[PDB]
Coordinates of N, CA and C in Angstrom, one line a residue:
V1 N 9.1 -10.3 -6.2 CA 8.6 -9.5 -5.0 C 9.5 -8.2 -4.7
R2 N 8.7 -7.4 -3.8 CA 9.4 -6.3 -3.3 C 9.0 -5.9 -1.9
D3 N 9.5 -5.0 -1.3 CA 8.8 -4.5 0.1 C 8.6 -3.2 0.0
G4 N 7.4 -2.8 0.0 CA 7.1 -1.3 -0.1 C 6.0 -0.6 0.6
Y5 N 5.8 0.6 0.4 CA 4.3 1.0 0.8 C 3.3 0.6 -0.1
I6 N 2.2 0.0 0.3 CA 1.1 -0.5 -0.5 C 0.1 0.7 -0.8
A7 N -0.4 1.1 -1.9 CA -1.3 1.9 -2.2 C -2.5 1.2 -2.5
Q8 N -3.3 1.4 -3.9 CA -4.3 1.0 -4.2 C -3.9 1.0 -5.5
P9 N -4.3 0.2 -6.5 CA -4.2 0.4 -7.8 C -4.5 1.5 -8.3
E10 N -3.7 2.5 -8.8 CA -2.2 2.7 -8.7 C -2.3 4.0 -8.4
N11 N -1.1 4.5 -7.9 CA -0.7 5.8 -7.8 C -1.4 6.8 -6.7
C12 N -1.8 5.8 -5.7 CA -2.6 6.2 -4.5 C -1.8 5.9 -3.4
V13 N -2.2 6.0 -2.3 CA -1.9 5.4 -1.0 C -3.2 4.7 -0.8
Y14 N -3.1 3.8 0.2 CA -4.2 3.3 1.1 C -4.2 4.1 2.2
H15 N -5.2 3.8 3.4 CA -5.2 4.5 4.6 C -5.2 3.4 5.4
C16 N -4.2 3.5 6.5 CA -4.2 2.4 7.4 C -5.1 2.7 8.6
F17 N -5.1 1.9 9.4 CA -5.9 1.7 10.8 C -5.0 1.7 11.7
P18 N -4.3 2.7 12.6 CA -3.1 2.4 13.3 C -3.3 1.0 14.0
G19 N -2.6 0.3 14.0 CA -2.5 -1.1 14.9 C -2.1 -1.9 13.8
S20 N -2.8 -1.7 12.5 CA -2.6 -2.5 11.3 C -3.6 -3.0 10.7
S21 N -4.5 -3.5 11.8 CA -5.4 -4.6 11.4 C -5.9 -4.7 10.4
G22 N -6.8 -4.0 9.9 CA -7.6 -4.0 8.7 C -6.6 -4.0 7.5
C23 N -5.6 -3.3 7.4 CA -4.8 -3.1 6.2 C -3.8 -4.2 6.1
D24 N -3.4 -4.7 7.3 CA -2.8 -5.8 7.1 C -3.5 -7.2 6.6
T25 N -4.8 -7.2 6.9 CA -5.8 -8.3 6.3 C -6.1 -7.9 4.7
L26 N -5.9 -6.4 4.4 CA -5.9 -6.2 2.9 C -4.7 -6.7 2.3
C27 N -3.8 -6.5 2.7 CA -2.2 -7.0 2.2 C -2.3 -8.3 1.8
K28 N -2.9 -9.1 2.9 CA -3.0 -10.8 2.9 C -3.9 -11.2 1.7
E29 N -4.9 -10.3 1.7 CA -5.8 -11.0 0.6 C -5.4 -10.5 -0.9
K30 N -4.5 -9.5 -1.1 CA -4.0 -8.9 -2.3 C -2.8 -10.0 -2.5
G31 N -2.0 -10.2 -1.6 CA -1.0 -11.3 -1.7 C 0.5 -10.8 -1.1
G32 N 0.5 -10.1 0.1 CA 1.7 -9.8 0.7 C 1.5 -10.6 2.1
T33 N 3.0 -11.0 2.5 CA 2.8 -12.0 3.4 C 3.1 -11.3 4.7
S34 N 3.3 -10.2 4.6 CA 3.4 -9.3 5.8 C 2.8 -8.0 5.5
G35 N 2.4 -6.9 6.3 CA 1.7 -5.8 6.0 C 1.9 -5.1 7.3
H36 N 1.7 -4.0 7.4 CA 1.7 -3.0 8.7 C 1.3 -1.7 8.1
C37 N 1.2 -0.7 9.0 CA 0.9 0.6 8.5 C 2.1 1.3 8.3
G38 N 2.0 2.6 7.7 CA 3.2 3.5 7.4 C 2.8 4.8 7.2
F39 N 3.7 5.6 6.9 CA 3.1 7.1 6.5 C 4.0 7.4 5.4
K40 N 3.8 8.0 4.4 CA 4.7 8.1 3.0 C 4.5 9.7 2.8
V41 N 5.5 10.5 3.5 CA 5.3 11.7 3.3 C 5.5 12.2 1.6
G42 N 4.5 13.0 1.2 CA 4.2 12.9 -0.1 C 2.7 13.0 -0.2
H43 N 2.2 11.9 -0.1 CA 0.5 11.9 -0.3 C 0.2 12.0 1.1
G44 N 0.5 11.1 2.3 CA 0.0 11.0 3.5 C 0.1 9.6 4.1
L45 N -0.9 9.1 4.9 CA -1.0 7.9 5.7 C -1.2 6.8 4.3
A46 N -0.5 5.7 4.6 CA -0.3 4.7 3.6 C -0.4 3.4 4.3
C47 N -0.2 2.3 3.6 CA 0.0 1.1 4.3 C 1.2 0.6 3.8
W48 N 1.7 -0.6 4.4 CA 2.9 -1.4 4.0 C 2.8 -2.8 3.6
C49 N 3.3 -3.5 2.4 CA 3.2 -4.7 2.1 C 4.6 -5.3 2.1
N50 N 5.0 -6.5 2.3 CA 6.0 -7.2 2.3 C 5.8 -8.3 1.5
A51 N 6.5 -8.6 0.5 CA 6.4 -9.5 -0.3 C 5.1 -9.9 -1.2
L52 N 4.7 -8.3 -1.8 CA 3.9 -8.1 -2.7 C 4.6 -8.4 -4.1
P53 N 3.8 -9.3 -4.8 CA 4.5 -9.2 -6.5 C 4.4 -8.1 -7.0
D54 N 5.3 -7.8 -8.3 CA 5.2 -6.5 -9.0 C 4.0 -6.3 -9.8
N55 N 3.1 -7.2 -10.0 CA 2.0 -7.2 -10.8 C 0.8 -6.8 -9.8
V56 N 1.3 -6.2 -8.6 CA 0.2 -5.5 -7.6 C 1.2 -4.5 -7.5
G57 N 0.6 -3.2 -7.0 CA 1.6 -2.2 -6.9 C 1.0 -0.9 -6.4
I58 N 1.5 0.1 -6.1 CA 1.8 0.8 -5.0 C 2.0 2.4 -5.1
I59 N 2.5 3.2 -4.4 CA 2.5 4.7 -4.4 C 3.4 4.9 -5.6
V60 N 2.9 5.7 -6.7 CA 3.5 6.1 -8.0 C 3.0 7.6 -7.8
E61 N 3.8 8.4 -8.4 CA 3.1 9.7 -8.8 C 3.8 10.0 -10.1
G62 N 2.8 10.6 -11.0 CA 3.1 10.6 -12.4 C 1.8 10.9 -12.9
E63 N 0.7 10.4 -12.3 CA -0.8 10.5 -12.7 C -1.3 11.2 -11.5
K64 N -2.0 10.6 -10.7 CA -3.0 11.1 -9.6 C -3.5 9.8 -9.3
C65 N -4.2 9.8 -8.2 CA -4.7 8.5 -7.7 C -5.8 8.1 -8.6
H66 N -6.2 6.8 -8.7 CA -7.1 6.0 -9.4 C -7.9 5.7 -8.2
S67 N -8.4 4.0 -8.5 CA -9.1 3.3 -7.7 C -8.4 3.1 -6.4

């Protein structure tokens, strides 16, 4: 696992609803045991996930955003 800004698979950001509310639940259904909002200057607004496995993934740049 890692602790990171969660995107969407792959090379994206998600967008968070300040509060955490929705994105926290999104983090938990993907499989991070805490999540929050955050901002990652680069792309923009993003969400955060603690204890996501590395077979779930995050902000990357190299490509552009996917799904």
